[model samples]
Target: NNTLYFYNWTEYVPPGLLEQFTKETGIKVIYSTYESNETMYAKLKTYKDGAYDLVVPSTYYVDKMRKEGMIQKIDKSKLTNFSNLDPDMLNKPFDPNNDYSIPYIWGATAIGVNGDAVDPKSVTSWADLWKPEYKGSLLLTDDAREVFQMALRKLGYSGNTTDPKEIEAAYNELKKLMPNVAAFNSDNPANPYMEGEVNLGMIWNGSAFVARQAGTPIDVVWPKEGGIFWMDSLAIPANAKNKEGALKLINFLLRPDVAKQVAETIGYPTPNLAARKLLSPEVANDKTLYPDAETIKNGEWQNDVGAASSIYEEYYQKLKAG
Candidate 1:
């Protein structure tokens, strides 16, 4: 059967994309979805014998999968639209030189402040979130990687460090911030910011954009130490059955028109330079969606900590138990 087995975030793409791709290329799509990177990794790692043709993994998972031989390197010649991607988004640490993955979209994890209640200028760094006055006033995202990244950066180390002692030290620093956390949210973090439940938050840039547009006073802040960024990239499983079909699908999705539509519908920043040009001036220029080059310059991309992932999971649970 001529088909592309696809997997990614739940409802990640614009409606009708699968149909449109099939309509144009006659290659059927069997799309699946997942809630987190770990779940998708487990499913693929558990049964990598041609179960799926392609999957979208965030930056760190791409690193993990590549290093573990769970994904295949892309045959660049098979993807003509590859040039349409933004140079800044390509050649990431996860898969240097775009061998195994192609960036799909990206977002930065940083502060989102309800400026009406908190001075945005005052919350300039991740360290600022630990202030005593912010006790019972912060909304930390529920994800372990992001939560730990903040503390790691504030402690003056690479957020991606897998050093056991470093991870433990960050956990200790994180526990100190726990009392200030009014809540831990992963889904719709913008809600609390809008409802006046939390004045400051660790929020995704896309969520901050939604909050500000929906009348919340949230302002995106790139921490002085640097915000952590994650890019969901298109990759082929090492054992994908329809490799050719998967490459075709990847090229189709990277087209400027297709990429623009997905970005506009999903409300996330597209890593397609060609697609950004198709966007309206407002969206193309919005700082919430696209941070300045300097901000991007100072940002840290998330990393896969290999075996240390279990250690992070353990500490995360312990911190949450508090």
Candidate 2:
């Protein structure tokens, strides 16, 4: 069977992409999806073999998977369009020198503000969330890492802090913030933001972009204290059955025109230098979608916290129950 199995985030790729790739390469794609990086990792790690040919994972998962020997290094010589990627996006700590992955799209987690309810200038930093006026209008992502990270940054510590004291402090701060948070939303925070129920909250840039595109009067801001940035990349599993076909699909998607289409359709920023140039001025110039270099520089990528992650999970459960 000339088929390639791909597992990725839901709605991440454009509608007709698999068909286009099939048209060009004669390989049908059996595409599937998972909701989060952790779930994707669990599935792959459990099977520990050829269930899928290609998988898309966040940068941190790429690092964890590599260290665990769950993924294989890429054959760069096979990727003719490899040069199309932005140099800045390569050689990241996750897979230094682009050994195991190819960057797909990237974005930041920042504050989303409802312009009708709060002046954008008034919500300039993570500290602003503590102000009493926004007490009933705030939202936080339900994910423990993101919520804890937000608090850690506010407290002037790295989001990946392993110090028990720091983790406790952050947990306490989250408890305090919970009274202010109208909801702890992980899925579709934009839906409430668009409905005007939430005026300010942590949000993903891609979600904010979609809200704006749909005429929701919401704006995204990189909090002055900094924000978390994430990049998703394509990688082949160690047990992939169709490595050649997977590489072909990767190269095909990396083509500048195809990359641009994916970026526009998925409402995320492409890491392809050539593809960015092909985007319309409105998209290319969007500050929220493609943050300025300084903001990008200040942003942190979430690292695999190793053994400390279990401690975080425990604290997260406590926080949830408390």
Candidate 3:
């Protein structure tokens, strides 16, 4: 009888799923939205044991919340469908044994080169984004984690490294291309590309899907230095009232049929292996979703950098000051 809270990524789950969950489970789902993990973290910090049943946060943020004792450790026995999940996602370094979170959406952050302007075949690395030709045509995520990760990857350092000299080196390199940047934004960057307003951007896989579905001329290329591998997982706050209902909801979503419907509607890849079998050929074969194994191996996922977070924030402030 408790109200189930579901805070998810913007345009993540298909809206209709809410009504359907309510219909089947009799638990009222109160929905909320956030554009990025940082935004969600800031909001949750202010809650101080506030109401909420579930939140789908990125891997890093999940680690962050878990470390800070903000979220509850999930009791797997309550989730009857837990065994159906792909065991491959288990034992992720961030949440070993998948005790605290359940994988919800899987994606990568990579470059989208305008084929009409930039030859997709040419841009193989983040350094290419700094080329003079891309000046005033380049776009990147507004988030500090992504900005720093891309720059660090190009500089040939660990994307999650907190080394002062390395971070400074990466920041300086990024500044070289700042003058060329058209906009630093989140959400889908589809409209700007469709309008022919921006030629190149570092965008999320989902946003890239939106652009392709809209028939934009943009071609996706996983940056050669490396791209970012991100998995947004659903976690229940420790203080949630609907733990039972939340577990049921999480179980329901991991179902292959529901996973495929959610993936098809949102245009992003589902981590569920069974769901992959149900996807249309076009969706299944999409390079953007099912990138090469090498790409996955080369790419780095966000992790808690300890105090390096403050350093990233410092450089980010300096970047914004200009």
Candidate 4:
């Protein structure tokens, strides 16, 4: 009742949401941040004590965690504002019937380029990022699945491919991508483009939106191969010490006003239907923040890769190590 340990993605929380939560609930929250789902899952699995109360994981990760009982089923009765959520975001393949997870924010990972220095038309697909002209000018997210997905999709394979050979082929493709990577950023992928430190590479829709809003002249290009579309969800770890507090946080987050601020602040599309109407006309009408359905049609949503998790980890480590 005194504290809530909340583990989440880097920069996922908007400025004052957590502070406001503490003020309202009188439960101080210790924020633990992870750059990737693997980092979150590995630390959670190895927890000896201080197991995080709540965490945010991508779609496929929910399936992985649910299978292992790493997370507990969410109690719907405790969530007073669950109806505020978009119906399309619910009943995901990863967490069916909204049993153990709740969609927080959804976006796609795609190519982002600063128009000032780069030709947007030249970079239309995941394969285009491999161009020699942009060597060492790219900033990729420090994420395994996302980085691998770029190459996997470029090679015309499923981003969630479980075949070891296919996984290895993607890894080999990433090795060449290393030289072009100026940096692997998970904290704020938009900062590099905003500051002119990096021109282009893989970036989330909101990160690009937020940067462009800051006067960074950039473009979000959903590759012909498709982007990685994901909805990060809130789930309580099985060993949580404060389930009630976690549930309280979830409900507070589901509040339309709070969700609006989060979307406006973080620049991600909110799955809260009520929050969408609350957005300013400019933001609501912006196609960058809210991509067209046709653009998302071919977008590949990642899934649990079964036994290939280890293979991905192994190759991911090797890819980053070199």
Candidate 5:
């Protein structure tokens, strides 16, 4: 095969992993990137060609793709190191039995606070951000589901809530606090938090870890009320141009050494259990990178919320448009 089209979150994959995979496997990988699952899904659904061979969509949207028959069934047998994955992470509700997707990185939606600027003891859960002093200093991911999920969890509800009343209530609450939010854009959002533009950021755990890595002097606060555990997985589209080459690239990524390098270089946690042990003790022990087992189970995982997907899209667009 001449090429493998691999799509992943921007900066989430190692800078040179694709080139290295090409060199090692002699498979030229055509790389593309997406910043949000919704954006990727919109483009994928509208195009019959599908454009790419491999895509890394959030676990929830992977379920949607599976239902639509837009994804190719992954062959775990082709991956020599498939056993290196954690048992729990395999066969997720989104892609039961791991038939169509390979879980890549599992991370939390946690709060990152400037330890110097905010009282760590005072800031705890998502609800705390609505407090007065934190006004104009709170930052959150712009992704509607992630942001809304945190708010719902704070209200003692599930992050995957689909009830019309519950969903509306959550959105109303978020709209109220919209004024307090510093900014919701994702382009280097944490830069302000890192540079002290804001006191706290409700951010992806990987971003927090990256900030801490750069000596930004921040601490990831795992609110006792629980948080989000999200898995980004790789699935081949039904119209993919190179199935064999895509699988080869997928296996190359799963290799322990290669996986460790990707995690270290991109500053995101790799779900490869073998790779975890191979990384430097610093990367391994970074609590923010891999929160405790209890933290992983703290909040409920996200799922496609049936018709609520439209409701989410409705409000999501409104928020962005506003």
Candidate 6:
């Protein structure tokens, strides 16, 4: 039997998507997941390239992997529904001309607060996270990029800055929140949040959506400082064993109807312009899922910070230890 091995983020796909793809194309999908971009990168780099036919990486990794020759350029001709994608998302700095990867889903990193645990009206900005009232109940992502970016944005510095002084200042600012933070989980902070173990803190938009959908009394807070925007993309590895199957799967997901279902199911914004028409008013109109233009304009995307990654990691370790 022909199979397409996929490595993607956990809980990203709708439950029946793989089965539907198999039914339509007779190509089996062997799906696996990684919790973070660093974990995914380590796995892909450790394994031989063709080990997986396709992998979904965040935009920053798409740039890193392309430069390292880990992923190959995509054939736009094979993607019949390629035009369905929003042009605004194309030709990003990570993959100029959109040659290497296709956008799967996009979202913002913002704060999620359990309304039952705290007054929603009281939590309007990032500064609220450091408040004494929220002590021992805040959940922070363990991701270095996201955590550092939060501090950087709060300090009014570009999240991608390599300046040592700026980085040091960001770290110092982050230390103040440590007293209030309950955990630094990157894998799935929603579990604790939904269980009422933690109330307010930073989270990806999708995680917050699921928490709300699962009956958790929570709401997403787009801080006055702004949020961090991101995109997860699908790309073929350079040594893909089944290039034809990979391309077929990409095209299948690009279909407007399928994209709509994915957005509705996962509660994230889709880059498919055609899919926007198919989305329900609830999903389409949700500002948390699709923030306002001013918010989007002010948000920063994660970039491959090159040699400075170690610096962030070092600070992350210190924050965790202290």
The TM-score values for the models, in the order shown, are 0.86, 0.90, 0.93, 0.95, 0.93, 0.95
- Kindly list the per-residue Cα lDDT of model 5 for residues 217-296, writing each as its tens digit: 77888887787778898898998878888888888878899888878865678889899889998888887777777777
Q: In model 2, which residue pairs have backbone atoms overlapping below 3 Å?
A: none
- RMSD for all candidates, in order, please: 3.0, 2.5, 2.0, 1.7, 2.0, 1.8
| Candidate 4 residue spans exceeding 4 A from truth | 48-51
Q: Clash pairs of candidate 6?
A: none
Sequence-dependent TM-score of model 4: 0.95
Q: Total clashing residue pairs per candidate?
A: 0, 0, 2, 0, 0, 0
Error of 1 at 265 (Å): 3.4
Per-residue alpha-carbon lDDT of candidate 3 for residues 194-214, written as tens digits (9 for 90 to 100) = 677788878787777777777
Global lDDT scores for all candidate models: 0.84, 0.82, 0.81, 0.86, 0.79, 0.85
Ranking by lDDT: 4, 6, 1, 2, 3, 5
Per-residue lDDT of model 4, residues 1-322, tens digit only: 4998988887779778889998889999998788788878888888733347999988778878988889998998999999999898886666678988999988889989889988888888999888887798999988888888889999999998989999899988988878898988888888988888898898888888777777888898879999888778998888888898999999999999999988887788899999999998878877767878887788887778877888888888887779
TM-score result, candidate 2: 0.90
Stronger candidate by lDDT (1 vs 5): 1
Top-scoring candidate (lDDT): 4
Clashes of 6: 0
Query: How many backbone clashes can be found in candidate 5?
Result: 0
Better of 2 and 6 by TM-score: 6
